[PDB]
């Protein structure tokens, strides 16, 4: 489209060895926004791996991830990198690199994935964010409605609220829906609607229809580190 993240193809790598994944940026300006890289486990996890800056190449790392992960940039290439070091099974992954803007502090353009395969074969002061129910079977034409709830106020120093909503649809990177509660991101239709305050936030679908099916996240970056729930699975009966 318009703006574009562009990640590195399957990486099949040996325990052990390094590996570096790139996302390339196009259609806007690169040093003008954060890039933030993101983990998914095989299933409905999202875990923040770490921030850069491109203008500066300054860094912020989830705990969890500092020691193994290390951002860098290329700004002459438009290029952010994430280096993973002594892999193992577990880093087994899809990772995503994601623009975040900073009117929103949401993640507005992702990268299509890179699939990590870690082989030797040939071929409690964090947020918490529980998202129920885990599973939402309905019949085509249901209204949804989708809970997530914090462990701490989500509420900024500048009296805003960093909840934001997002759509996992089968085999895609996720993608922005409503940010900071109630404000639906471009392109995103009215049948969404995001309400909630302090702690507890509820997303609802008025019709669902097929374009909707996928799992839900929500995810609060008025903290540090940012957090996402453990998504919501909306299918069919
Ligand atoms: O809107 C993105 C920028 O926000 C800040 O800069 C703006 O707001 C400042 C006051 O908080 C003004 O002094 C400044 O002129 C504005 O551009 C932030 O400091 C920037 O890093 C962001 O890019
Ligand atoms: O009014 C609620 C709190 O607002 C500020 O703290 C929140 O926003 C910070 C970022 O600006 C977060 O780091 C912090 O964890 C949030 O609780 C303010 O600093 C707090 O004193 C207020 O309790
Ligand atoms: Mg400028």
């Known amino acids: 489209m318009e703006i574009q993240l562009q990640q590195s193809g399957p990486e099949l790598v040996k325990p052990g060895a390094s590996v570096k994944i790139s996302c390339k940026a196009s259609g806007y300006s690169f040093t003008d926004y954060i890039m933030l890289w993101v983990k998914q486990s095989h299933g409905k996890s999202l875990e923040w791996i770490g921030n850069?800056?491109?203008?500066?190449?300054?860094?912020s790392y989830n705990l969890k991830f500092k020691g193994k992960a290390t951002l860098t940039v290329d700004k002459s290439s438009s290029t952010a990198y994430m280096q993973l070091n002594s892999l193992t099974s577990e880093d087994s992954a899809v990772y995503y690199c994601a623009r975040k803007n900073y009117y929103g502090s949401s993640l507005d353009y992702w990268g299509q994935g890179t699939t990590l395969t870690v082989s030797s074969a040939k071929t409690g002061s964090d947020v918490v964010m529980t998202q129920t129910p885990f599973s939402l079977p309905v019949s085509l034409g249901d209204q949804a409605s989708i809970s997530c709830r914090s462990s701490?106020?989500?509420?900024?120093?500048?009296?805003?609220?960093?909840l934001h909503w997002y759509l996992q649809k089968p085999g895609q990177s996720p993608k922005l829906l409503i940010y900071?509660?109630?404000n639906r991101f471009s392109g995103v239709p009215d049948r969404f609607s995001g309400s909630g305050s302090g702690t507890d936030f509820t997303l609802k679908i008025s019709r669902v229809e097929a374009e909707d099916l996928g799992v839900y996240f929500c995810?609060?970056?008025?903290?540090?580190?940012?957090?996402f729930g453990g998504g919501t699975k909306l299918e069919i009966k």
């Open positions: 701490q106020s989500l509420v900024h120093s500048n009296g805003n609220t960093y």
């Open positions: 900071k509660v109630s």
């Open positions: 850069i800056n491109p203008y500066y190449g300054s860094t």
């Open positions: 995810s609060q970056s008025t903290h540090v580190p940012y957090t």
